Amino acid sequence: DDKMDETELLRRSDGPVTRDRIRHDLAALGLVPGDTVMFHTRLSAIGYVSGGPQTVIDALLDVVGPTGTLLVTCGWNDAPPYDFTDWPPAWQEAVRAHHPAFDPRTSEAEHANGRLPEALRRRPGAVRSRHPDVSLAALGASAPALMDAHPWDDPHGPGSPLARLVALGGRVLLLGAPRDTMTLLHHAEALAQAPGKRFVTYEQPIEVAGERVWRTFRDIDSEHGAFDYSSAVPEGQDPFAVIVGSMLAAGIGREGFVGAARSRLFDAAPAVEFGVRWIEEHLNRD
Amino acid sequence: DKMDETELLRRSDGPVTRDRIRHDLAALGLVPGDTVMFHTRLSAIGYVSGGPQTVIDALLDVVGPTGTLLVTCGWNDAPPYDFTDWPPAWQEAVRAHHPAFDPRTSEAEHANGRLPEALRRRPGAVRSRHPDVSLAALGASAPALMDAHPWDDPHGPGSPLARLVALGGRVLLLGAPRDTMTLLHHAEALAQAPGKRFVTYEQPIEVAGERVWRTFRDIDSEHGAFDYSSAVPEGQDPFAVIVGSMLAAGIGREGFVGAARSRLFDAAPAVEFGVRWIEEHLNRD
Ligand SMILES: [Cl-]
């Protein structure tokens, strides 16, 4: 029921949530002109947002202003599965012969990231990074250098957009999104040194020189965790949720509300520094 | 989700590729130069390698550069028709702050699925200007089909749907159920019968760079342009009944595209049939 969904969201926020009200709530959280902010969104948690994703994006642009930048994690919803080489031989041949290349302009973001990354990447002037598995998108003053030349291998590591967010003094905003959605902690996993690090190898079709070619990629296991967190994390619990919870308890990050959405704003450099130290201390046992 | 893939892969007995869809579309009767409005239920096709992009590429492969694809978009985040029933403070917030419809960025209705949202993002795609029932089109006839969508009676004469009929266009249901045929709203707008139901609603648009509120009139495309209670059996959707009767009268062809039950109609005889069906069932002189 469409009617119903609207009724519940209106009730949740006690009426429509507007662009200027979101702008006000974001400034109260600590977002300021000139910031670069990567943001994860659970749109319905805000309430009934008058104008949907476009209103959230324009409120964010109002706060950071023309010299600031917004960033999201996109990925590729219709990528071939990592394990597509475990299918009957005629099937995977069909994939290898006919699966289209990743295309930054048209390939849709992963559906699990919700509507906001797919709205951001389609904004006029938005820039989407070239990686077929873990592309980001950005909008604003620093968007070309942040997204430029996404490193094929180790795409969460030293050369990556996430590293550039840290070096810029950027921020991470969870906008109703839960603590485990903080993508930036994959950059922490990529930097962290501890035994038992998990890596993945997969292939995906990309377009280079205007022709479609397959490429093999290496990354940390950003799906099941770059380590076994068995010893440091109660089972049933998500490692990133535990790290961010400890982060917050150590005084890194500010919590508040944007509409009806429980929201958290972090500086990216201390969050990554905390995350790598968390992983190395819990997992090295020296 | 690996089981999700196993379900889809079992449904189509392996990946459905661009070439396989093109093959099945041609066998259903789509030809080079066709203009085709299509409604899609991706999961009914099976495991489509490449998702919506692959469906669109296959359709372009069949109709070629002289052909045109059309979809219905609408506007997912339009103000609800009845926001003017809300408490005064809530409707004043919508009036002062709801952003204008923007054909380049306003999202299609979530219920229309992922194909319309992918089509309108293609390079060269054209999206009509109507804030409530916009269409999008891609190909040689897209500018003329989408141009100057009438504000009032947006399914009536001179609308994109009327232009699809006049062009000799077609309608494709690609695993979509018989009741998503948008073209039959054009039949409802043309049909002469008692008790026709209309809606009047307000939506923000941009006119010469300024955001303005406008009032719009349409047939009730949400609840049905007529009370169909005496014309259809209980629990059946009117458009499904009309399309079923259309098929049984020899209008339209049916087959499979991948695993998806699919139906292809010529738009001019579909609308003529739909108008007659409504006038015969709802006048009963
Ligand atoms: Cl490049």
Author numbering:
A (entry chain B): -2 to 283
B (entry chain A): -1 to 283
Q: What text does the study give?
A:
Here, we conduct a comprehensive functional analysis of the Antibiotic_NAT family of aminoglycoside acetyltransferases. AG resistance is primarily conferred by three classes of aminoglycoside-modifying enzymes (AMEs): phosphotransferases (APHs), nucleotidylyltransferases (ANTs), and acetyltransferases (AACs). The fold typical of the Antibiotic_NAT family is evident in all structures, composed of 13 α-helices and 8 β-strands, and determined structures superpose with pairwise RMSD’s 0.8–1.0 Å between 197 to 266 matching Cα atoms.
We found that the Group 2 member AAC(3)-Xa, derived from an Actinomycetes, is limited in its AG specificity to the 4,6-disubstituted AGs kanamycin and tobramycin; the only other Group 2 member tested in our host E. coli was AAC(3)-IXa and did not convey any detectable AG resistance. As indicated by our AG susceptibility testing, the activity of AAC(3)-Xa is limited to tobramycin and kanamycin. This analysis suggested that gentamicin would not be accommodated due to the Tyr79 and Asp130 residues, which would clash with the 4”-OH group or the methylated 3”-amine of the corresponding AG substrate, respectively. Based on comparative analysis of the AAC(3)-Xa and AAC(3)-IVa•apramycin complex structures, Tyr79 would also introduce a steric clash with this AG in the AAC(3)-Xa active site. Notably, Tyr79, Asp130, Glu220, and adjacent active site residues are highly conserved in Antibiotic_NAT Group 2, suggesting these are critical determinants for restricting the specificity of these enzymes. In contrast, the AAC(3)-Xa enzyme exists as a monomer in solution despite forming a dimer in the crystal lattice. Representatives of Antibiotic_NAT Groups 2 and 4 were the most restricted in their specificity, and this was reflected in more constrained and smaller active sites, as revealed by the structures of AAC(3)-IIb and AAC(3)-Xa.
